[model samples]
Target: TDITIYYKTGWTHPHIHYSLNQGAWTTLPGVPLTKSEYEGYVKVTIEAEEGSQLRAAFNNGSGQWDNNQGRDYDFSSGVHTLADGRILSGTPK
Candidate 1:
């Protein structure tokens, strides 16, 4: 199946960090949702299986999984985190 994943890389700073598997993120969210974005966000469009493994985080410094909590959250297929340090109210389209 086809699934789109988006992570809030930044809100407007030195730069934004968004990725899928891992690596240098994008400054402008891309076509395939590459490690890029514009203004303040990153997204990834992926094809996942029924039971595929998924994960993401800003493990560099800034943001640090909700104010330096020091841990990645449980990555769910439909779960999305907003740029303001809050999660989307419900399942997104």
Candidate 2:
């Protein structure tokens, strides 16, 4: 399952990060617009993991960490699991 998350920058240095399960958080590359053009989206492919989960965080030029401020959409088995119960997974979180 491919999921795309859309976000808009509220300030000049707005950025986002993502994590999979309890692993290390990785900063999402690329700069988003600051005002009128401040919208961007990332497409993530999800696979069937028994207890898989995804999380995200946001920062808006404040030089501080803002955790879990974005939307989360779950990828159910029906979306990426094969009939034989196998998963065609993509990047984790």
Candidate 3:
């Protein structure tokens, strides 16, 4: 299973900090997200399993962060969207 994340933040250099299976993080500012077909949106895919804990946060790669307004985002294997400090299932609107 896998988790596909779609982000729509207007950051200059967006990055995603994620942990799979309740593991440790990737690194500071995490991995850089690729530009998606949708305008103003970036995306990334993470290897995971169904029912496993998937935690994530977003940053501008400089210092700013969007950790779900300080609580961080949690999800499972599937598609998800992060925008305006909320995590939603499926594609971004």
Winning candidate number (lDDT) = 3
lDDT of 3 by residue, 1-93 (tens): 688899997887899888888789888889999888888889998877667777888899987988876788897888888877777999888
Tens-place lDDT digits, model 2, residues 59-83 = 5645554443334222332222111
TM-score of each: 0.40, 0.38, 0.90
> How many backbone clashes does every candidate have?
10, 0, 0
Q: Residue 54's C-alpha lDDT in candidate 3?
A: 79
Q: For residues 1-93, could you state the per-residue lDDT of candidate 1 as single tens digits?
A: 334444465433322233444544444422323343434455555455554433334432343333325443334445354454554622232
What is the Å distance of residue 49 in model 1 from its true position?
Answer: 1.1
lDDT of each: 0.41, 0.39, 0.85
Q: What's the TM for model 2?
A: 0.38
Best by TM-score: 3
